[PDB]
Amino acid sequence: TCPFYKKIPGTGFTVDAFQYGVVEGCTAYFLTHFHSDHYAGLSKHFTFPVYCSEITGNLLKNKLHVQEQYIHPLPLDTECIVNGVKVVLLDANHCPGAVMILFYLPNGTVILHTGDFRADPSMERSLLADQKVHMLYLDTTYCSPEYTFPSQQEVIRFAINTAFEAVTLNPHALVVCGTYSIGKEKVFLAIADVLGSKVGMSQEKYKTLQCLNIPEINSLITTDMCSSLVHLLPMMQINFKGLQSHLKKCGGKYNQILAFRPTGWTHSNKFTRIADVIPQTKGNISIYGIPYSEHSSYLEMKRFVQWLKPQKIIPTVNVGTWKSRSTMEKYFREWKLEAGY
Ligand code: NI
């Protein structure tokens, strides 16, 4: 059964609710982004209207085989009427094709559903600026002050400089980057660009990337692993055993691996600056964990909410325990008392 925080009151709409069977009273199913916890349940046999971004719709059609007649892509930053209700999709600064959804209810209530997002001050000048929001359905993944991490630009600077130094010292070094979903493509594209290489990967991953409307992508990626010195592998293979094994396969072309694991937050964030990050090493293999996040830090979240001044907050993440829920509700009240709304 579909939980309440996936339903939009006063509509026939649900958000990211594909794993509950036919939801009683739902006339349109919205999908915020192509991540498995959110799309769980979609397939070629789905026969209800799905509303999403263009990029999400490419992935539904080519990866899950959903039939074209049930895919309804909407442009961003554009007022659209869906089953008699005005909606707008906004960029969520999450993975490719990820959106927030603004719903303008027939009774005058305005609801923002963030999906998964990384709040940014640029959002304070979107179509959000133009009216009041009553209810906020909020990605609370990192809603606690211990969760700090650097900007995406500082992390990519660290990665490019690390990779370029290593391969200039040793032209026979291979760089490997882990992946298990869409998102974080800047990691591997930036390093390949500094090295003058395409990124090599499996056919299944090349197919996924070809659905993303990234400019000039044919110039940056390839399935010919032999011609590439940046390889993508599944995140589970980024360990000493899996990397030793991969290095065998390259036929003595390479004699060293430098590998990156873009994680979210890890507790090494509480003590160490990005400048100070060191790898784990074993022999001719080094593994860097880099804190590249596509979710808001605690401070980015707080700034967005204090700017928006919603009348009510509904968390969408960490809702399964009473301790989490009580912690989140305490921070929400702090933020409201500090800002005065
Ligand atoms: Ni996500």
300 and 290 together in one domain: no
What is the 284 CA–ligand 1 centroid distance (Å)? 34
66 and 32 together in one domain: yes
Q: Which domain holds residue 136?
A: 1-147+296-341
Q: Please, which experimental method was used?
A: X-ray
Q: Quickly count: other Cβ atoms within 10 Å of residue 238's Cβ.
A: 22
Q: Residues with Cβ < 8 Å from 132, sequence gap 6 or more?
A: 110
What is the 36 CA–ligand 1 centroid distance (Å)? 8
> What is the edge-to-edge ordering of all strands in the sheet holding 28-30?
7-8, 13-15, 28-30, 50-52, 71-73
What is the 137 CA–ligand 1 centroid distance (Å)? 15
- Distances in Å between the alpha carbon of 271 and those of 148, 209, 276, 278, 295? 10, 35, 10, 13, 20
97: left (phi over 0), alpha (psi -120 to 50) or beta: left
229 and 338 together in one domain: no
The last residue of one of the domains, among 279, 295, 311, is: 295
What is the 35 CA–ligand 1 centroid distance (Å)? 5
Nearest one of 60, 51, 132 to 99, comparing CA atoms:
51
153: which 2 tokens? 């630009």
54 and 42 together in one domain: yes
The resolution, in Å, is: 1.4
288 and 307 together in one domain: no
Please spell the DSSP secondary structure of 226-277, one letter per residue. GG-SEEEEEGGG-SHHHHHHHHHHTTTS-SEEEEEEE-S--GGGGT--GGG-
What is the 274 CA–ligand 1 centroid distance (Å)? 24
What is the 107 CA–ligand 1 centroid distance (Å)? 31
How many Å apart are CA 251 and CA 276, to the nearest integer? 34
Q: Which residues, by Cβ under 5 Å, contact ligand 1, an ion?
A: 35, 116
99 and 12 together in one domain: yes
What is the 33 CA–ligand 1 centroid distance (Å)? 7
281 and 210 together in one domain: yes
Number of domains in the chain: 2
Counted residue by residue, the chain has a size of 341
Q: Are strands 85-91 and 80-82 parallel, antiparallel or unpaired?
A: antiparallel
152 and 232 together in one domain: yes
133: which 2 tokens? 């929001």
CATH number at residue 136: 3.60.15.10
What is the 303 CA–ligand 1 centroid distance (Å)? 21
What is the 173 CA–ligand 1 centroid distance (Å)? 33
What is the 264 CA–ligand 1 centroid distance (Å)? 11
Query: What are the helix and strand counts (H, E) for the chain?
Result: 8, 18
What is the 339 CA–ligand 1 centroid distance (Å)? 29
How many Å apart are CA 338 and CA 330, to the nearest integer? 12
91 and 137 together in one domain: yes
107 and 154 together in one domain: no
What is the 256 CA–ligand 1 centroid distance (Å)? 33
What is the 169 CA–ligand 1 centroid distance (Å)? 37
What is the 292 CA–ligand 1 centroid distance (Å)? 14
What is the 296 CA–ligand 1 centroid distance (Å)? 12
CATH number at residue 227: 3.40.50.12650
226 and 115 together in one domain: no
Q: What are phi and psi of 39, to 5 degrees?
A: -85, -5
Pair 88, 78: CB distance under 8 Å: yes
209: which 2 tokens? 């990337």
159 and 142 together in one domain: no
The last residue of one of the domains, among 261, 277, 295, is: 295
How many Å apart are CA 224 and CA 212, to the nearest integer? 20
Pair 55, 95: CB distance under 8 Å: no
What is the 34 CA–ligand 1 centroid distance (Å)? 8
Helix-strand-coil split of the chain, %, nearest 5 = 35, 20, 45
What is the 94 CA–ligand 1 centroid distance (Å)? 7
